Symmetry: D4
């Protein structure tokens, strides 16, 4: 099967929420992405509704032609929204109310019960769960044990590497983590900080199932337009695999 691309459109909403106006509309962006290389659309419903809103989730759930990947913190509010929304995928992330963006991976190994119940609860509601974690063997083994079918490896450290060596070290760390996760029966994704110049090495990793990318695509889109921004990212991804 081919490498999939999940396009995170949160930042379309962050441009909108800077004013009280309704544009640009994430609902439009999703249609564009889905027709230009996206295999899924991702939204992170933050507790503070900083960008994506309940209104967005609600309409997107009815308009997406592919499937929704709902990113959210593991809280009662979100599990409840998640269960009612029935998104195809749900990606559990850690979240501070005023963090710049998603900081690190979930602390699964240190909250086994909490994650186990959440996975169970989402799974009963027919949602395929993905735990966003660091390329960390302990967290990976834990994710598998709490029952999650997917993990999504945080590519931030790789993305922020300051030197070519630091970068190669993070790459290898991620590739090995991915291999270990698959050996435990997990399906594995990756995301955060992926760009047009750093994505191919990540996409070359065989175990990768889907990459979730947002900011870099939206950043290219304001110059170039979303359609091309997405098509270009999807092109580079398949090139790395061929």
């Amino acid at each position: 099967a081919e490498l999939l691309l999940g396009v995170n459109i949160d930042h379309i909403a962050t441009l909108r929420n800077a004013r009280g106006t309704a544009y640009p509309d994430p609902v439009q962006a999703a249609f564009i992405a889905e027709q230009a290389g996206a295999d899924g659309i991702t939204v992170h419903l933050r507790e503070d509704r900083r960008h994506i809103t309940d209104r967005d989730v609600r309409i997107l759930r009815q308009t997406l032609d592919t499937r929704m990947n709902l990113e959210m913190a593991v809280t009662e509010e979100m599990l409840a929204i998640a269960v009612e929304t029935k998104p195809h995928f749900c990606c559990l992330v850690p979240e501070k109310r005023q963090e710049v963006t998603t900081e690190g991976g979930l602390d699964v190994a240190g909250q086994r019960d909490k994650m186990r119940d959440a996975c169970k609860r989402l799974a009963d509601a027919g949602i395929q769960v993905s735990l966003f974690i660091d390329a960390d063997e302990e967290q990976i083994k834990a994710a598998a044990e709490v029952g999650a079918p997917f993990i999504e490896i945080h590519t931030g450290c790789y993305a922020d590497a300051k030197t070519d060596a630091e970068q190669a070290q993070e790459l290898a760390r991620i590739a090995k983590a991915a291999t270990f996760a698959a050996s435990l029966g997990l399906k594995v994704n990756a995301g955060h900080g992926l760009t047009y110049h750093n994505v191919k090495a990540i996409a070359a990793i065989p175990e990768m199932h889907e990459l979730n990318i947002g900011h870099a695509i939206i950043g290219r889109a304001v110059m170039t337009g979303l359609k091309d921004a997405v098509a270009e990212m999807k092109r580079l991804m398949l090139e790395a695999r061929g």
Copy 2:
């Protein structure tokens, strides 16, 4: 002489600052806009460097092929920077820091002395001053008496009008204010809230020298790309005048 377009690129920076990375870069957005219909580039340096930064102003000042319109609050920090930067145009606006955007016009009539000096100060630097004000005769007479070459009428109320009637009222108000301003020897600009659907009626106002538009252009841009977004806005404006 033709109606001019000033593109505000603040929101390119908004998108960039949502994260710690450097893209999208306001410097790229300016080249694009200048080559697609913009006659000048506007940047608003907020006290809280929310979006546009000193870095941005410093490089932009060296890369713009047209000219800078520096929107700023009337404070000593800003006046010093302006005198220092020598932007072709300077647009004085009220500011609070935690504001969603620039609300209404400047209280010029109520601070004649403070405005009188800033105008003289900036003009001695060879900068052309624009006072962002409400479509209010008291304020226009003030701006005139104080010596500012330009005023920029706030189109916010017109943009937010809730009914067709309310819109029409706000329009006639801006149109009558523009004629009045012109009769006092002021050159008049307009801006804030202008979109692809409400710009023409404002562009048709004879006295209008330049319209400063930002958010609606960036909003169209994440869908179509900055180039077409700017070219479209400019096309609508020239059509209005024709």
Copy 3:
């Protein structure tokens, strides 16, 4: 006051409804059209929901950046839906459950009580009413007398003209009818059967406020794409006025 274009996206749904699938989605078409020259989006909620559905109307009302023009028959059902949806505009038309399309013109002059009540009811909910009528001064006088602020002249006979002379005659007739309409205080729109080759003569009529075009645009769109189809239509319309 620029000639406006209202894009009827009914036929996007005509294509969607031929199968059980959900694409093409009217919601996407609306965003494209509103950004390519459409000043308003029009949908005909038929008694038989052959294309636009309650879902489309419910979501469109939330995603439209411009304004909805709800075409509907005068029935208790429709009037209830309209009062609740609160479209910006509402266009009342004659409906025969099994018709190929709107055959043409409401009999207002013979149902003044019915139309009078409909108009008031919709106006009470804040909806600007448009009575779809033939280029007939008796019908027009009636529309004015019943209180509708708008009328839309049926351009179908003009569109189906079999000879250049028949066409010329229906043009003159539409033109005289529109001038009469305006002298009564009515705002006048026109629609049905307009094409890329017959639209200019109608757009040239000075009294025209908005043209409502659907089928020709969708027919061009499957070939060239909605964006260019809408833009071309709007371009020809503005050329006619110049």
Copy 4:
């Protein structure tokens, strides 16, 4: 031997037939498609001529630069039309006058005499026959036994799969069925319900000769234009094979 694409333009006519007008014209669509990646054009001449008409078939047979694949039910009428038109390919399908679309699969195993005669008759006129069947080895063995050189596996159950597991199962089933088909000397096509997101798994099946896709392409076309819609589909198909 490259995977071929057969573009079914039935739905261009679906849009044309909603009115009395003659556009969009299937004849134009055919030229566009044949020049954008289509290797053959497909039309379904329905008993009720709801879309493609005798005119379309008569003109298409003269304007096609590639080859026609006539989809039709097995009736004396159709067989007579086919013998006279002499399409390069003919695809026999089950037809119920009022169906939404081809429901799926001919019952060949239970009408061997009928199908045997049809196949011979068409082959006598030089037409290469294709029996549209379900991924069913009994039906497939029969198609081979009756003398048809081609079969087209119905991909509808796979397209309408409600769960990833159901989908995976219909894929495996289509795949095993195709391999069995080939071992019998049959050439195997596939069609119905294929989309931009579900086409690769089908295109990857090595035995596949030509995919016949219609609705998804037209649905994308109203948005982006036929040319790009066909090209995108063909591009994804060739990527799956590589």
Copy 5:
């Protein structure tokens, strides 16, 4: 009314007829032209079928969305074909079997009876006749007297002018001829040798109803593509009139 453009597609056929292949097909070119600025499609059925064939006329007559302008010599063969074909317009030209192209205008003043019967015969068959003639008062008066509703002034001499003065003289000669023709009640067209650099002066002439252009459009199309080639010619024409 706006200046119309009749696109002559003969040369699409001349490229085709250089081989025994069927491409490029005039039928495709006509659809493109008609959707890119053409108001009518012109074909010259030559006695030697050098480019356009009976097959072309026959299919075009069924596919054109606008109307056909049949150019032909005044011979029994053509009058008969013309009457059976019932094209909207028929343009009578003089013709040698092996001339490079149409050489000059019809000799109407010297074949009054012949032209009178031909006009009559075509007119009974409901065809609007146009006599292609030189910008010559005697020929123009004659055309009017023999009954033709249209004349088409040969722009060849203007097109071939060797010097700027020779050119200005031909321009004036054509403008005066056009004025004289209109004064006699004739509707007037122009064509032959019109290019992207010489068309505007011709289009600026008020009496001009439709320009018929071929070679230059096809010559640009091989580089640029027909759509743009036509749109560009149509753009220049309307510019000259505004």
Copy 6:
């Protein structure tokens, strides 16, 4: 090494020569093609200067950025011009003057001495010689014995095959001939009649060095423009080899 594309621009001239004007100009068409996938430009100087002229060869020789492939008949006039012009490649073909195009291959086996000298003569000028021949071993052995570096297999019969079977026969014949030619140390090219739909099977033949294609490319060009036409042909060829 990759499969090369040689674009024959003769038919650009065909279109130009249909009239007395200078457009379209082969010189423009060459720049376009060289920048869109062509690795060389081919021009066939016919004795009757039907399309390409001495002017064309003289300027082209100075403007080509890649290299010229001069197709000519084996006559003294031509040999002299070739020796004079110094084209990188020279392709010897049979010619009659009133022929629709180049029919079959050169009779090399039957004129060994004449061909032996032309080859030696041209090679002494530093020109690489290609003998246009039929996929016939007798001719290939002849071309080998005579000293020509290259042979170009005539793909005409393959292009004209009337049935799928006949096509397959012609293909295997060209494929086996190419391998044979290669085994005798000849470099092999192919051409004549290659289209967008039959090129791949020929491109896939391993031994093929360069395919010379003209008419189908010019034919696509009047619709889409030379650039896309060439780029498309080249894309299909590289796909075949991959």
Copy 7:
């Protein structure tokens, strides 16, 4: 009638001559420009052949579809080249210190016999002569006295104005000089330093016959490509006259 644009392609050669290679080729740039809004092509053959070369001139003279405007210094070498070349226009420019004014134009009032001689000589050969001069009444009287039919006003000072005031002044001086020149029977062009942002004010001057623009267009072309850069400039010019 129509304001004309002459594109100076000198800097195409400037980029080519930076190396020993032949690309980019001015011959190609000329075809692009002539089909994108250029009404003529300008090349300045410098004595030192810094950019444009003898071959450029020789070949361009055979490939231009419009006309050549040969720019040259007044020497015997150039007069003989121009006489032999027969360009349509010749623009005499200063190339040495003993030829220019303190501003940049050709010193005509100081070389009256030389110019009188060049003018008469070029004219005998059928070349229309333009004298490149300053917006200077003395030089203009001189040009009129000497026999030149055209003058081309140097817009450099205007283009280099450092302040708005300074710019308005130079504009004025050019406009006045244009009116003055016209009153003496001279046709007048303008050029040097014209850009996308300063051209409209110059285009609006009514007496302007043609604007000669080079560097800004090529400067834009490296980013957007020559076609759009030329088209855009022409569009801006026509907007200025509407």
Copy 8:
């Protein structure tokens, strides 16, 4: 893994410096290239600042989203600039006669102490150093001996080959030199004179890390625009490795 492309934007500055103006601006060309396939940007800061200037370097260092490859001659001025500039890469090149070999590369084997010194010094500052040298074993041993981590092979001879044979020879010599260089622990780049038609053979060499290309891309850009020129070059490179 992926072959990389470094775009040299020197000639953007070459076109700008031909005048006193600031356009075209290298800062813009860099954003375009980095988003169109460039993996790095190269600027050669010449002692004479013929094209790239100090401001270019200073600003580019702050705007590049990828990395800078500073090309410079080995002098104290440049070493200090590079040390202070901290570009990611530095490519040492000959700028004076007493620095080059008879071919074009830097004479390392003849200035071993100087290079050993530059290499060590740049390295201490974190700059990866590349020595631009000939496909010469002696210079390569020297570069290895001296400590440089990279060499960039001069492809000029290969690019200027006058005959196919001559070209195959230089290709071979480059390939051998690449393998040899790699065997000594050096990473290797290539560049100078690479074009759209000669790059694939160089890209196919496995040891190649990055190709540095400038003039051909800018040469193409003036025609097609920088974005497509960069994209096209990158596409050709990747095709070569597939």
